């Protein structure tokens, strides 16, 4: 039964990424006063399969000055992490019920720098290494707030578990409080996923590797929006209606993933220096201040949460 559960978890998220590609294209088109894909299949639902076939049918021109080891284990690692992140997620009951689950998320997210850096060091150049260093620095820098935000918001629920946030928001979202922490969390998800306006790394791989990188990217997108939904937009949980919880979670995650593309179409890009100034001069001060605020709140209020 467990292998069946694993299949039910993995297959749909991959399908959902493959179709999130199409949703992005169509939304950007309609925002640009055009349609997008209409032909290959009814409304385009065959275009992702077409593209997958095309890529995987191309011929890989593997750079000659390179290392096959780091050439193969970079996208393998990326996809492995992007899939193993979806495991602990309570939807509402999790495939693997972990304590310290958000910490597992932090770590398995921070482990992608290794691939995004080995790819560059493998490609024998200096421009690719420059780009890789810069992207690594960006991702690293934003991991700091990605961590502190949770460190401060996990004091309204005294546990690092994801199955406690359901009862923590059994009456009210964690957005009304910490809406300044969300606005800083919703963005570090863009910069972490190198998503516009933070795409200074994609604005040098064969068909298969490029496809794996694409899959990892969009999977991480869906997952970050799912974390937002679970944490700051706690859906409904009636003990007998996991169906209800899952429906609401899906709706909110789709809202968020469409907001990402809304933004991509709406705004220009950033400049690496200004992108780093943003964090190190606007997000870290406010983050530390609100961290102290949220360490004091449960004290000068008698609302310090429990450890079950």
């Amino acid at each position: 039964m467990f292998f069946i559960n694993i299949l039910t978890l993995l297959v749909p998220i991959l399908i959902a990424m493959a179709f999130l590609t199409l949703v992005e294209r169509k939304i950007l088109g309609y925002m640009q006063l055009r349609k997008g894909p209409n032909i290959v299949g009814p409304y385009g639902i065959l275009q992702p399969f077409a593209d997958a076939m095309k890529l995987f049918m191309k011929e890989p021109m593997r750079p000659l000055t390179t290392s096959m080891s780091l050439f193969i284990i970079a996208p393998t690692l990326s996809l492995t992490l992007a899939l193993s992140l979806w495991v602990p997620l309570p939807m509402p009951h999790p495939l693997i019920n972990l304590n310290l689950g958000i910490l597992f998320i932090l770590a398995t997210s921070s482990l992608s720098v290794y691939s995004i850096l080995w790819s560059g060091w493998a490609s024998n150049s200096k421009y690719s290494l420059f780009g890789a260093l810069r992207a690594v620095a960006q991702t690293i820098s934003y991991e700091v707030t990605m961590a502190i935000i949770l460190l401060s918001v996990l004091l309204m629920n005294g546990s690092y578990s994801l199955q406690t946030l359901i009862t923590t928001q059994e009456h009210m979202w964690l957005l009304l409080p910490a809406w300044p922490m969300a606005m800083m969390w919703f963005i570090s998800t863009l910069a972490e996923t190198n998503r516009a306006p933070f795409d200074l790394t994609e604005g040098e791989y064969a068909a298969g590797p490029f496809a794996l990188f694409f899959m990892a990217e969009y999977t991480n997108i869906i997952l970050m929006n799912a974390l937002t939904t679970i944490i700051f937009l706690g859906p409904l949980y009636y003990i007998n209606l996991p169906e209800l919880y899952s429906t609401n979670f899906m709706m909110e995650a789709l809202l968020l993933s469409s907001t990402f593309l809304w933004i991509r179409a709406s705004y220009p890009r950033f400049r690496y220096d200004q992108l780093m100034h943003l964090l190190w001069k606007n997000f870290l001060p406010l983050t530390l201040a609100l961290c102290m605020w949220h360490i004091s709140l449960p004290i000068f209020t008698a609302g310090v949460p429990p450890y079950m």
């Binding site: 055009r34 290959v40 076939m53 095309k54 068909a207």
Partner: protein
């Protein structure tokens, strides 16, 4: 017979390769504003599956748009070589078809067909985005009319 399933396999491969055409837009001159107008809403390049502009390292088709000079030919050839097989080329305009209004000049290549092999020639100075789209669909059909697996089987 194996012939039936091999025909169907080739048909599927060609469907994918023709429905996921990604262009490298080697745009040199006034035969590129028309490609832009073709990506624009009224023609929506992206509606058939042809992305607006991708990287020259993961592209399938290559649109040569405008006058190719003797100072620019080596870079175009290097791009063609870097591109991954199976790769196709489309020559958009008189300049790239035969040199056009500068055919008798000292700094012009009298046809991109001397630097790279071409599959579809689009005539005009400039050819409307409608004509460029017609040419790209002609390329789609040229792809749909391939028999790779058949020739490898009856070899």
């Amino acid at each position: 017979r194996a012939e039936y399933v091999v025909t169907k396999l080739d048909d599927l491969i060609n469907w994918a390769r023709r429905s996921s055409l990604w262009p490298m837009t080697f745009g040199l001159a006034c035969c590129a504003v028309e490609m832009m107008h073709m990506a624009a809403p009224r023609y929506d390049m992206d509606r058939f599956g042809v992305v607006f502009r991708a990287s020259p390292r993961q592209a399938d088709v290559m649109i040569v748009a405008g006058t190719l000079t003797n100072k620019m030919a080596p870079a175009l050839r290097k791009v063609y070589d870097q591109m991954p097989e199976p790769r196709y080329v489309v020559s958009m305009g008189s300049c790239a078809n035969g040199g056009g209004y500068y055919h008798y000049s000292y700094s012009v290549v009298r046809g991109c067909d001397r630097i790279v092999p071409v599959d579809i020639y689009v005539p005009g100075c400039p050819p409307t985005a409608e004509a460029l789209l017609y040419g790209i669909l002609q390329l789609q059909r040229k792809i749909k009319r391939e028999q790779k697996l058949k020739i490898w089987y009856r070899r």
